[PDB]
Amino acid sequence: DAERAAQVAAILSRVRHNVSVHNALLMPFFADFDRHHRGVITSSQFAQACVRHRLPLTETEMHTLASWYSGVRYLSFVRDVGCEEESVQYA
Amino acid sequence: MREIVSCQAGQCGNQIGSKFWEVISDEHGVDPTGTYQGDSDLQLERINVYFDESSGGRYVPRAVLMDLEPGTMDSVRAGPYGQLFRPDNFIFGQSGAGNNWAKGHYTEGAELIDSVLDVCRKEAESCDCLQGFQLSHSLGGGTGSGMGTLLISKLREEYPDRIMMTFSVIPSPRVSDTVVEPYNTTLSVHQLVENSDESMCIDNEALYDICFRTLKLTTPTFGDLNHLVAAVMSGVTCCLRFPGQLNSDLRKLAVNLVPFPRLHFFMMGFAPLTSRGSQQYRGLSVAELTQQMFDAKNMMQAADPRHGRYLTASALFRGRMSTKEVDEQMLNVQNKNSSYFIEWIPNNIKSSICDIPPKGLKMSVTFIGNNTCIQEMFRRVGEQFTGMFRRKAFLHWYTGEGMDEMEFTEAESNMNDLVSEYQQYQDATV
Amino acid sequence: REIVSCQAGQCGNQIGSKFWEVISDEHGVDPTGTYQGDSDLQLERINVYFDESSGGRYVPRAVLMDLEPGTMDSVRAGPYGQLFRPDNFIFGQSGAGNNWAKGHYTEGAELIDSVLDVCRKEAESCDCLQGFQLSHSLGGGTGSGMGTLLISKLREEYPDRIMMTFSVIPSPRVSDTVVEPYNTTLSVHQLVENSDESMCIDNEALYDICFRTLKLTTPTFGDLNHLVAAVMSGVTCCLRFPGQLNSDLRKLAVNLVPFPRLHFFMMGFAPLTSRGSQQYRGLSVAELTQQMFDAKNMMQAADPRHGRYLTASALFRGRMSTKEVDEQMLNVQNKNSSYFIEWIPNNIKSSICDIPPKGLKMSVTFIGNNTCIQEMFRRVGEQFTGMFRRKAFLHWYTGEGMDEMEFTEAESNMNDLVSEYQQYQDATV
Amino acid sequence: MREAICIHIGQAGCQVGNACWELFCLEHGIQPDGSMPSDKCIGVEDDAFNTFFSETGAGKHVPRCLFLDLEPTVVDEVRTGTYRQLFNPEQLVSGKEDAANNYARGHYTIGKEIVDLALDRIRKLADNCTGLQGFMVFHAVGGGTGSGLGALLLERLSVDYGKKSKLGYTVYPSPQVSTAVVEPYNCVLSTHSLLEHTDVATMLDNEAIYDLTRRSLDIERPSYTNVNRLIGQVVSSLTASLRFDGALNVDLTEFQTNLVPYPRIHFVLTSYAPVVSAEKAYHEQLSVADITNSVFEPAGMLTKCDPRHGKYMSCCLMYRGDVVPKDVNAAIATIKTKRTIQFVDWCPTGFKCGINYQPPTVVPGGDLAKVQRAVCMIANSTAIAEVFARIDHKFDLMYSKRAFVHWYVGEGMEEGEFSEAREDLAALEKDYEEVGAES
Amino acid sequence: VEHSVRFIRDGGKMLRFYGILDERDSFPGGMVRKLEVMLFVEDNSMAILQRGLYLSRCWLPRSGSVAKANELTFAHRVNGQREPDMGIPDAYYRDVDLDVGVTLNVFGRSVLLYDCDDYTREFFMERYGVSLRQPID
Amino acid sequence: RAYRDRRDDLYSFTNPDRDTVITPVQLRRCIVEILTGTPTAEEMACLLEFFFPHLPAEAYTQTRDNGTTYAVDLNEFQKRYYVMTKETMLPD
Amino acid sequence: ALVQSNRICLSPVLRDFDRVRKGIYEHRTCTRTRFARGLATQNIMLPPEQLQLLIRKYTVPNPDGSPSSEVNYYLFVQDVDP
Numbered sequence A: 001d002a003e004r005a006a007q008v009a010a011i012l013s014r015v016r017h018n019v020s021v022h023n024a025l026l027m028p029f030f031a032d033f034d035r036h037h038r039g040v041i042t043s044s045q046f047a048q049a050c051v052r053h054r055l056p057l058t059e060t061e062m063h064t065l066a067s068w069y070s071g072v073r074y075l076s077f078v079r080d081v082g083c084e085e086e087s088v089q090y091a
Numbered sequence B: 001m002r003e004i005v006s007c008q009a010g011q012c013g014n015q016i017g018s019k020f021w022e023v024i025s026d027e028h029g030v031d032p033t034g035t036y037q038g039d040s041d042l043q044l045e046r047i048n049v050y051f052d053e054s055s056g057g058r059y060v061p062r063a064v065l066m067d068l069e070p071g072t073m074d075s076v077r078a079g080p081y082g083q084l085f086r087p088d089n090f091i092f093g094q095s096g097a098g099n100n101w102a103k104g105h106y107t108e109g110a111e112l113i114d115s116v117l118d119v120c121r122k123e124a125e126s127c128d129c130l131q132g133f134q135l136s137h138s139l140g141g142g143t144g145s146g147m148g149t150l151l152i153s154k155l156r157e158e159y160p161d162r163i164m165m166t167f168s169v170i171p172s173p174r175v176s177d178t179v180v181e182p183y184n185t186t187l188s189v190h191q192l193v194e195n196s197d198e199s200m201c202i203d204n205e206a207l208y209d210i211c212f213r214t215l216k217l218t219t220p221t222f223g224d225l226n227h228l229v230a231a232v233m234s235g236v237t238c239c240l241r242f243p244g245q246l247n248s249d250l251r252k253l254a255v256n257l258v259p260f261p262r263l264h265f266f267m268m269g270f271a272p273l274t275s276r277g278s279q280q281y282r283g284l285s286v287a288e289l290t291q292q293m294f295d296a297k298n299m300m301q302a303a304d305p306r307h308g309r310y311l312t313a314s315a316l317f318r319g320r321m322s323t324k325e326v327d328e329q330m331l332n333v334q335n336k337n338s339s340y341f342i343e344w345i346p347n348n349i350k351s352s353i354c355d356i357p358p359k360g361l362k363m364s365v366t367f368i369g370n371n372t373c374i375q376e377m378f379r380r381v382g383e384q385f386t387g388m389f390r391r392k393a394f395l396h397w398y399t400g401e402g403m404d405e406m407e408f409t410e411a412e413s414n415m416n417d418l419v420s421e422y423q424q425y426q427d428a429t430v
Numbered sequence C: 001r002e003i004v005s006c007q008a009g010q011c012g013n014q015i016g017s018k019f020w021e022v023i024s025d026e027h028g029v030d031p032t033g034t035y036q037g038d039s040d041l042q043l044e045r046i047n048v049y050f051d052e053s054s055g056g057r058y059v060p061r062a063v064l065m066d067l068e069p070g071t072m073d074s075v076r077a078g079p080y081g082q083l084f085r086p087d088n089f090i091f092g093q094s095g096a097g098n099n100w101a102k103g104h105y106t107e108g109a110e111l112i113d114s115v116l117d118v119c120r121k122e123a124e125s126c127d128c129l130q131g132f133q134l135s136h137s138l139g140g141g142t143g144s145g146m147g148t149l150l151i152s153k154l155r156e157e158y159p160d161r162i163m164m165t166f167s168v169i170p171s172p173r174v175s176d177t178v179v180e181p182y183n184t185t186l187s188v189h190q191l192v193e194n195s196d197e198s199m200c201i202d203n204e205a206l207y208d209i210c211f212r213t214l215k216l217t218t219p220t221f222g223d224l225n226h227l228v229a230a231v232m233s234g235v236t237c238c239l240r241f242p243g244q245l246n247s248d249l250r251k252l253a254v255n256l257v258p259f260p261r262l263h264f265f266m267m268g269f270a271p272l273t274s275r276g277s278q279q280y281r282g283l284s285v286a287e288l289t290q291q292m293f294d295a296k297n298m299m300q301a302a303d304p305r306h307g308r309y310l311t312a313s314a315l316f317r318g319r320m321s322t323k324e325v326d327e328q329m330l331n332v333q334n335k336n337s338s339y340f341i342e343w344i345p346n347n348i349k350s351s352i353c354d355i356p357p358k359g360l361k362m363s364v365t366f367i368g369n370n371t372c373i374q375e376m377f378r379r380v381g382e383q384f385t386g387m388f389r390r391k392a393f394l395h396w397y398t399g400e401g402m403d404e405m406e407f408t409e410a411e412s413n414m415n416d417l418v419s420e421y422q423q424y425q426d427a428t429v
Numbered sequence D: 001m002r003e004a005i006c007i008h009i010g011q012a013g014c015q016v017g018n019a020c021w022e023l024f025c026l027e028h029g030i031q032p033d034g035s036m037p038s039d040k041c042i043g044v045e046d047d048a049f050n051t052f053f054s055e056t057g058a059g060k061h062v063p064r065c066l067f068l069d070l071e072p073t074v075v076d077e078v079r080t081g082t083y084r085q086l087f088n089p090e091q092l093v094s095g096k097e098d099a100a101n102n103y104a105r106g107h108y109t110i111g112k113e114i115v116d117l118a119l120d121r122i123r124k125l126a127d128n129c130t131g132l133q134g135f136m137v138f139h140a141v142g143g144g145t146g147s148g149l150g151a152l153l154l155e156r157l158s159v160d161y162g163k164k165s166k167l168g169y170t171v172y173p174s175p176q177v178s179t180a181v182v183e184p185y186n187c188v189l190s191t192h193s194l195l196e197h198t199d200v201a202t203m204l205d206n207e208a209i210y211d212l213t214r215r216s217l218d219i220e221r222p223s224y225t226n227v228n229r230l231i232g233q234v235v236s237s238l239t240a241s242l243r244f245d246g247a248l249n250v251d252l253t254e255f256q257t258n259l260v261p262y263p264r265i266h267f268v269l270t271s272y273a274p275v276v277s278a279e280k281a282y283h284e285q286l287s288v289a290d291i292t293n294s295v296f297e298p299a300g301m302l303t304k305c306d307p308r309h310g311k312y313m314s315c316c317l318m319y320r321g322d323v324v325p326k327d328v329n330a331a332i333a334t335i336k337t338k339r340t341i342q343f344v345d346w347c348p349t350g351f352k353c354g355i356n357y358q359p360p361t362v363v364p365g366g367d368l369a370k371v372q373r374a375v376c377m378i379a380n381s382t383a384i385a386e387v388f389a390r391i392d393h394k395f396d397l398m399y400s401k402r403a404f405v406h407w408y409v410g411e412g413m414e415e416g417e418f419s420e421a422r423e424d425l426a427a428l429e430k431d432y433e434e435v436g437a438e439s
Numbered sequence E: 001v002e003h004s005v006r007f008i009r010d011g012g013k014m015l016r017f018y019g020i021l022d023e024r025d026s027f028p029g030g031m032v033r034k035l036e037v038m039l040f041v042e043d044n045s046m047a048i049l050q051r052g053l054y055l056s057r058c059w060l061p062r063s064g065s066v067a068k069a070n071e072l073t074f075a076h077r078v079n080g081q082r083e084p085d086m087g088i089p090d091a092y093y094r095d096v097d098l099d100v101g102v103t104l105n106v107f108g109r110s111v112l113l114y115d116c117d118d119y120t121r122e123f124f125m126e127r128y129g130v131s132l133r134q135p136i137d
Numbered sequence F: 001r002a003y004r005d006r007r008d009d010l011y012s013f014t015n016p017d018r019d020t021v022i023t024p025v026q027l028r029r030c031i032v033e034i035l036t037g038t039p040t041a042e043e044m045a046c047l048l049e050f051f052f053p054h055l056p057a058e059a060y061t062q063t064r065d066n067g068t069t070y071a072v073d074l075n076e077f078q079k080r081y082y083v084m085t086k087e088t089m090l091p092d
Numbered sequence G: 001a002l003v004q005s006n007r008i009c010l011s012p013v014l015r016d017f018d019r020v021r022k023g024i025y026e027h028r029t030c031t032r033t034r035f036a037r038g039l040a041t042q043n044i045m046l047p048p049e050q051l052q053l054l055i056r057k058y059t060v061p062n063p064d065g066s067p068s069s070e071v072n073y074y075l076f077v078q079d080v081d082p
């Protein structure tokens, strides 16, 4: 799965650059879809949240992200895409 | 020799005519390729009633398509038998009908009626012996009503002595899918009364009831609806196209069904009509044919035959069946329900036998009835028209293309006179 | 027996090129002039439009005329352009300039000696010259001026020979110059005086036929020239092939020219239908007559309904019976007597030729004298008087060896012709 | 044939048109670059794109749209976004400075120097269209550009193109939620244009869409993205009748004639269903009766206006997808038997139906789910008098003491324009009451 | 049930084929027509586009005759199947039938399929695992 | 950032990264499509060598960038502009 | 072939000849004269030799083995009209 890993890494790097540019918080948008606060949202939920954020992602890349984070671990997705208040480097 | 030229006005009339030519080519053994593949000589014996031969031996329908929109033209052409029709019979305009009788009869239809009449005149001249003009349209639409009325009006002077069948689809409240049914139907009926020597009313609600209870179909499209209309539209010309023990034609039907000039509105019925599950169980016989034929649920009108009295009726029985039996069954139904008929016009029913049954049918019958209960539909349309006209709603559209309130008042008066004639003849006594 | 063709102007040259297209197709002649027909009937009258050489090559009896060598070069670059003689390409160094003055008087007349020379050579070559044919446009410079001058000279040299012209007159929807009124006015009286029969063609009617009838999307000058060449080749079918009732070129003249000034015709071809619509149109004499007398099928932009037919001639080609070709004319006369002159019942010649056009079973060409041909002359006269009242563009004509009063004379001649047409239209028994 | 020209005035109109065109591109298979890939095919009826997209020689498809705005932020965002290669560089008109949320500024001072090239672009779009069916202008009367420049452009289009169809999809001010304080002035002043020079006006206020999305889409915090996506879905549902074949086909004039009873009365409220949650899996395929009942329910309505306070005059229903006329007619019969909604006495039928075989298309990551069938409503009802009552009562409250009027006066408009606008709105309310009154 | 299962999985997706319909020998003025024979897999129904809609939404019979669906006895319409019965089983062309190099009997005329798109090739590989023949001239 | 291809890629659609650099593909599409220039192969090779000195010769005709490994920012673009201006200036 | 050409239905007339004059609802057999009756009423003119051959082939045997004067019209109908 080297090709899939490389594609996922490139997609995450692009989303990281876009989120760093926009300085936008993804947690409320992604967590509205998690009604039970279980940390899991489905692929449609992740797709709608990313389209909300206008992330530069296509349907195939976006389904690939959902499968990689598989439900979708939106918390880990937000951690990876990173923010000034919410990044892996924050911890 | 004796032949019918068909016209299809509006999208409703166009699709009905498309299915009618479906059925006719089925009977005459004509594939979409236009050649003849029938297994009988009887099909070719009188194939010139609806078809004209080409240079290559193929057969082309005598159909003139009419609509201010090209969408239904394209759909009919793309249909399975759309390759049969002559492209120069596809008369259409760029601007849509706008669902307006004024648009279809005075401004947009006037500029195309010249070409339409040119095509019709060419067909009539090419035909050896003109017999009838049949038109298929809906009175509730814009170009099906207005342009169809204009076409029959201008055809009347050109050919005063030739039969004029109209297959007019009058809408019903259960199927009311527009808001200008009253205006369009009122402005069309007064034209039909003096411009059609036999009008035949088709009601979507009743065909739908047929599909629901007589055939027990859950989710049918317009396909079997147009098939139901085409059944009678083809069975009318059964004696025209095929031999029989008691031949007839359009004028035999009209002479035996029109006692007075303004009473020429007919309701249609087809027998037999059974679901697939009960198809093998039911024994097809003339008894079942007549029982279903004189039943409301088989009629193609949302009009109740009990509240009316049949002035005249006609059963075109198709198939090999015995003349005494059909005639005595008509006598039996008359005697059983004399109240349902009219006393002063004895022998109300017209039995005509055609040797060739419909393909796949052992025997069948088409019923054409001049029953009084058409006055109910006329009354409901008049009530709706009066309700709209008092408050003037949706009238600025019609006055835009040059019409005035005088035409609407005259149409309302004509419809009132038409319904009053049926009312008088319902309770008229010897 | 022989018809010698002359082709003036760009319009005339291209139309004649497509005419020889059609003739070589009909007679089985290659671009190299070698016969390849599959029937003896082609060789049996190949000599009418062709002359045999020492090596058996068939060269057209054609003469080409243009003050611009570009059209001659294009013709030679064409597919059958190699078929013509080289010496018949008589061209001027300086262009016609779209000016009747120097297409007819100074530059046209200087060069017309050689075209008379080659026309004389063709006439001597012909065993019994049936007549002359010309193809040109009345709105151009050399097609109008030099064409009329050739017509006049050949009329003076051969008084008793039929002289067809095929004039492409303009229309408001087609006008691609500003001097149609002047050129047409200066040419119509010359045609009236010096032509036995003049056949009118309008690009507006050609385009209307190409769209409404042929259902084409981009109909070009090639298609227009094919349409006109169909009629040109159908005129002489009875000469080039046998038939149960043939006709020479003088049959049409004698039966369609009741009066000397009334020799202007309108063209028409049948069957004419789109490629996709040939499947249903049943080829028959009734349909042929219907499309023949249909107003829109007329390839001259006028409405025969507005006028009355002086005369008509229907040249049918193919294997068809005489009963229908007679009864259809009788039927159309009887049931449209309001569209025909009353004091001449039976206005229609019907000629029958056995050989049909290639790719068709039966066909017909219509040649018609109707008074509605006066509407176009009237509009051209109105345009001419509008431009002439203010001496518009007149210096180009006057400085190149012309005079003022001849314009008035030509206008008066057009007005007289129009008046004659109208007074024969409204005449009563 | 059947071409319709889309115009987008103001920021709201530009964003609504952006959503509409991003829906249309994926609906007709045209990529944002402007080309239809030969790898996959989305539609069967070729020339269906001819209404909204014009063919080019190279094989591309240029939208028949005019994004006109007086300020360059949104037009620059379009020029930068994924649809730059789709949209023509022209018909993308951006001014130098915004109308400042001022009807007078957008209609008298800044709009006069932009309407000339706006009309030039409209003419260059229309001459290409040989069968043009109408104009569809998206804007918001609340703002300044969409009010003033919209009025100017609508006036010029009415005087230039005659009586051709004109659909004004306008985002009216909402009863409680609002964006600006001059919004009531802009709404009242734009009423002149929306009456005399607008064939059918479609209200698309924002509270109704917010309430639709909070409830039927399970989105706690929607946005203008969802608002514009639902508006684009409504527009596509309306135009699908002429774009694709169907059992019942309707056109611009076809529904305009059945929808407008009187020339003044042409304001129609809209509602769309099934707006089912694509967040929600396991969704049962709703029936035609179910979707019709949901549409008639004021919960699933695109306009914040309760019809129970009024009465329907003409309802037009577009059924997209696999739809049976007997499912439709059973739904209509049940609706008529239902008593919670009332019609007017003079319009007994009052129902126009158009069935199209094309199911609605889903945008990437959209709140709407893939459904077999959907139905959109265009309803002319007398209940729409209440939104006008709200807006002009607010107008009177803010105008009784000359608030926010010096801007309009100084931007080149007379004081009597406000008075005549109020009188015209009062006449509109009065004639709505008159037409709703029993005979 | 199965209808919207197909609407969800196979719904809205489409198989294009490029075909030639030769009519030159059949009748005078016959033209060779370039057509797109295109199959909706949800309904499994074909339409033909002339490159201009040659054939609309319909199920195309194998025999080439729709006479038994036009049968005046309404046995052609089944309550649960939108596809007409035709009276005989497997009477209509299917995706397994469609292939490059196949002559379809479209309502009595032979349309020869000479090419298919990469999406159709991929769909066949993914579902039925059959390699469609390479395009022919 | 990329040329037209069967892929439905936002990189070939626009610049989704929204970053302030010019890639070789971006410059090529800019010259061809918005500047209305049609340089030949050698002319475009010289332009690409002038703008991106370290770009490999085989990547001149590539249809897609390798992210942002070869790009020029605003300062570099202004320096290249000043060099093209020097070619107009007199020798210094 | 004549049957599918002319839409021939001999079943009702043959059934009526089986049940005519007779209180028996059905016997599935009928006389040669009534078989010719049905053919003539359906208007199928046949040579006498052909009719004799048909009735001989479709006749029902008597119990003793000798041929009877009755024709098994039901098998004829089943074989001819499906």
Ligand SMILES: Nc1nc2c(ncn2[C@@H]2O[C@H](COP(=O)(O)OP(=O)(O)OP(=O)(O)O)[C@@H](O)[C@H]2O)c(=O)[nH]1
Pocket (backbone or CB within 6 Å): D009, D010, D011, D012, D013, D015, D016, D069, D070, D071, D098, D099, D100, D101, D102, D139, D140, D141, D142, D143, D144, D145, D146, D147, D171, D172, D173, D178, D179, D180, D183, D204, D206, D224, D225, D227, D228, D231
């Ligand atoms: N439906 C919808 N409406 C919007 C959107 N953006 C702004 N609006 C409307 O715009 C109104 C405010 O007007 P403005 O902010 O002045 O925008 P405008 O109408 O284009 O006027 P200008 O700013 O002068 O161009 C709000 O009431 C919203 O209803 C949007 O994305 N979708």
Ligand SMILES: Nc1nc2c(ncn2[C@@H]2O[C@H](COP(=O)(O)OP(=O)(O)O)[C@@H](O)[C@H]2O)c(=O)[nH]1
Pocket (backbone or CB within 6 Å): B009, B010, B011, B012, B015, B016, B097, B099, B138, B140, B141, B142, B143, B144, B145, B169, B171, B175, B176, B177, B178, B204, B222, B225, B226, B229, D247
């Ligand atoms: N039976 C039948 N009725 C139809 C069909 N198409 C339309 N209609 C009816 O026609 C009425 C509307 O007519 P319309 O389309 O406006 O006519 P047009 O404007 O002339 O094309 C509706 O009430 C339908 O019930 C059809 O295919 N079959």
Ligand SMILES: Nc1nc2c(ncn2[C@@H]2O[C@H](COP(=O)(O)OP(=O)(O)O)[C@@H](O)[C@H]2O)c(=O)[nH]1
Pocket (backbone or CB within 6 Å): C008, C009, C010, C011, C014, C015, C096, C098, C137, C139, C140, C141, C142, C143, C144, C168, C170, C174, C175, C176, C203, C206, C221, C222, C224, C225, C228
């Ligand atoms: N039918 C036809 N008309 C032509 C053709 N070429 C030119 N014309 C017509 O001829 C007119 C111009 O004539 P022109 O060439 O100026 O004549 P010239 O100056 O004497 O050579 C135009 O109005 C054209 O409509 C052609 O190939 N076919």
Ligand SMILES: [Mg+2]
Pocket (backbone or CB within 6 Å): B246, B247, B248
């Ligand atoms: Mg008789």
Ligand SMILES: [Mg+2]
Pocket (backbone or CB within 6 Å): D010, D011, D071, D098, D099, D143, D145
């Ligand atoms: Mg703004």
